[PDB]
């Protein structure tokens, strides 16, 4: 299963990269949200609304990355 | 044959890198949107407008890479 | 044989790198553009003009690399 062992490295590369990307993107965005809140606590719910509004875009690729990596890990492999 | 063993890795990389790129790019771009909003709320509609205008140009190459990666992982492989 | 697949590995590395480059570069540029707008929304169109002028310069090399990805995947093949 030389063919198979490369697949369990492929899923690893895909989802490790997706992990770093998504994690750091959300970290940055949430950090800016946190300082915005600390400036204006009585805006906190609207800024949470906006944080969730945009955060959905940071996941656009990294989830697709899981979508294919895990698929290969469990439907192709 | 040997083709099955390399393509599922090549696509893996080709899409994990685009994941990193789009994730970090959008995280950074949205951070300044949040800080600007917390600075001057009620300009939020205008910030959101031109944010989405710009963001559309950030996705270009990452999404091209995702498309070509899939075009390989299935239609080529 | 390898004279097929390693071409795809080369295409993957080239387009992945080009994607990370274009995405993160335009993310930084757009972020500074956003905060510049937030401090005075009445300049927005002028800033946007210069933003495009520069975002053109950003893309020159990535868009070479992306096209060479296709030249590899469909002329060297």
């Amino acid at each position: 299963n030389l063919n198979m062992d490369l697949l369990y490295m492929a899923a690893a590369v895909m989802m490790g990269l997706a992990a770093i990307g998504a994690a750091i993107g959300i970290g940055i965005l949430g950090g800016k949200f946190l300082e915005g809140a600390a400036r204006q606590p009585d805006l906190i719910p609207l800024l949470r609304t906006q944080f969730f509004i945009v955060m959905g875009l940071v996941d656009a690729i990294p989830m697709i990355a899981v979508g294919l990596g895990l698929y290969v890990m469990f439907a192709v492999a | 044959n040997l083709n099955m063993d390399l393509l599922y890795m090549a696509a893996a990389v080709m899409m994990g890198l685009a994941a990193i790129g789009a994730a970090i790019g959008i995280g950074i771009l949205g951070g300044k949107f949040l800080e600007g909003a917390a600075r001057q709320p009620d300009l939020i509609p205008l910030l959101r407008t031109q944010f989405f205008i710009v963001m559309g140009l950030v996705d270009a190459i990452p999404m091209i890479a995702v498309g070509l990666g899939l075009y390989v992982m299935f239609a080529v492989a | 044989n390898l004279n097929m697949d390693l071409l795809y590995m080369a295409a993957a590395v080239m387009m992945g790198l080009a994607a990370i480059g274009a995405a993160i570069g335009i993310g930084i540029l757009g972020g500074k553009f956003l905060e510049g707008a937030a401090r005075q929304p009445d300049l927005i169109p002028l800033l946007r003009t210069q933003f495009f002028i520069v975002m053109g310069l950003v893309d020159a090399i990535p868009m070479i690399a992306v096209g060479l990805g296709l030249y590899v995947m469909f002329a060297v093949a």
Binding site: - | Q40, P41, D42, L43 | R39
Partner: protein, 57 residues
């Protein structure tokens, strides 16, 4: 208070804590400052200079 050349009136008026001015926050959204170094340090000296200016007036 030098109201008019024929009439002056003693007034006791508060200057700390700062009286609520006849001003509206709505006009503020138009623009904001580049604070150097930062607003928390500037506001202090602004209020001190303002109180001094009112004692002088």
């Amino acid at each position: 208070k030098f109201i008019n050349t024929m009439s002056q009136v003693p007034t006791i008026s508060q200057l700390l804590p700062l009286p609520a001015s006849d001003d509206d926050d709505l006009k503020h959204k138009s623009w904001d400052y580049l604070y150097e170094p930062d607003p928390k340090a500037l506001l202090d000296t602004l209020l001190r200079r303002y109180v001094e200016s009112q004692v002088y007036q």
